Design a binder for this molecule. Structure first.
Ligand SMILES: N[C@@H](CCC(=O)N[C@@H](CS)C(=O)NCC(=O)O)C(=O)O
Lengths: 222, 222
């Protein structure tokens, strides 16, 4: 039965975990923990890193010996699973919209990570204020995109709803004020949370909202 | 005829331009320039930005009134075009490989940008040494991935070969020493370059190796 490897944190793994949950697909979850203060070494990962026959050894990874699958890119992984459970577009019109939103989600992750991982206080704060001034536009764009739709593509839930859920949730837990002029999105997150297996997943003891990022990062650390 | 919008740099647009070239698809290219130093305003873009009915107005964009398409995300755009010209995987095995490489290409784009755009001299230098420590592994992974194959998948060119061409070229023009022990990849670039339409594109008077990045970037400005 298939394996999903990633850190103890939510980070890039959550949206895959979310999709596995929704589709009720059985998986074993292999987690890696960091070292203690103030090292937090990745040695537990690095010991096994190059010895799993991964083309591009990285976290997360997904391994299905049973299906002869051994992958390592978060998007690649989620698109693979999306294909298997038909959580992809049924038309190129759909596909275009899905993939725009996909990339839109990733772009947020870039901006956020670039900031949450900067350690220089004088720099962290600088980027934080720069983020505050940029994201509102981003969130409005998504609000406009979604509009009266239930999910990103309308009525049907696609893998991008999982992607989007997490990055928006992370932003929510970071500065809700950014959602002040984009309420529609909060409703959307709730809509997702109300989903049966996502509600189970989120109400599990295994679920904790923190941490989002590594203990090394300023935000979402502990 | 369809329109491709982007800045007057290679940046994220080139791999799409490359693919359009190879497939001999007719397109009009709409280009945007920044303000002079030390300003670089985006006003030329911002004038037209919200007037094209783009869901996520951003550069690059692709518009084909003929087809009813108006997209804005680089990967989304290239995957759309890949689908139209069948430069995509024809098996899940193929697809999986393509999409891992795709993400691997983007991951380089990230690692390179955070460095080439960092104005802080001290920080720039730090990130540069960090790159020089990290990229070798990256390039070995790709070397191993490609092996004796002609193109990433085999004898068949996929859109990822274009993606990869550009980011590898950018890295080459940054530090050839990184490819000192990487003949396999150098051979790969040569192969892509020696495709007829790509040779035509690269030998055009419209083609200059620089600029790669924006004026504001430390590396690749013009
Ligand atoms: N600090 C980097 C990215 C940091 C990052 O996301 N890496 C962490 C959290 S997933 C990690 O533990 N990387 C090890 C791995 O997953 O290979 C940046 O912002 O440029």
């Amino acid at each position: 039965a298939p394996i999903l490897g990633y850190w103890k944190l939510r980070g890039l793994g959550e949206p895959i975990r979310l999709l596995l949950a929704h589709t009720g697909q059985e998986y074993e979850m292999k987690e890696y923990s960091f070292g203690p203060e103030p090292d937090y070494d990745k040695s537990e990962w690095l010991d096994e890193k190059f010895n799993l026959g991964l083309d591009f050894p990285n976290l997360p990874y997904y391994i299905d010996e049973e299906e002869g699958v051994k992958m390592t890119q978060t998007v690649a992984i989620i698109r693979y699973l999306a294909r298997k459970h038909g959580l992809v577009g049924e038309s190129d019109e759909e596909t275009i919209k899905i993939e725009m939103v996909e990339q839109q989600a990733i772009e947020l992750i870039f901006t956020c990570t670039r900031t949450w991982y900067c350690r220089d206080d004088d720099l962290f704060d600088k980027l934080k204020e720069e983020m505050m001034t940029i994201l509102p536009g981003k969130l409005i764009g998504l609000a406009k995109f979604l509009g009266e739709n239930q999910y990103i593509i309308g009525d049907r839930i696609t893998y991008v709803d999982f992607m989007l859920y997490s990055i928006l949730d992370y932003i929510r837990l970071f500065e809700e004020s950014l959602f002040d002029e984009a309420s529609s999105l909060k409703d959307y997150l709730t809509r997702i949370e109300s989903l049966p297996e996502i509600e189970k997943y989120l109400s599990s003891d295994d679920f904790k909202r923190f941490p989002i990022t590594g203990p090394m990062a300023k935000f979402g650390g502990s």
